[PDB]
Design a protein around this nucleic acid. Structure first.
Length: 45
DNA sequence: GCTGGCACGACTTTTGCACTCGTATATCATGCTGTTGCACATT
């Protein structure tokens, strides 16, 4: 809020927690071999 | 006859010369780059 945001909007700064998006067909894939790294690897065919 | 500005032979001044020894901070906000640590595929 406030208006360190007309500045924040125009510089198009990436926020702290971006929301992920998807592609044409998001079939159920959950995560294959979800190791200690980033888990829930979604692989929509 | 009286006087007042011009040149000459000593003196005096300048100049290249280039040559060496010789007290402090405490604005954040952001973006970019570099180093190191760690997960994943390989023979």
């Amino acid at each position: 809020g406030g208006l360190p945001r007309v500045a924040d909007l125009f510089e198009a700064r990436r926020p702290k927690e971006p929301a992920i998006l998807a592609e044409i067909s998001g079939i159920v894939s959950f995560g294959k071999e979800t190791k200690g790294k980033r888990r829930l690897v979604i692989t929509p065919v």
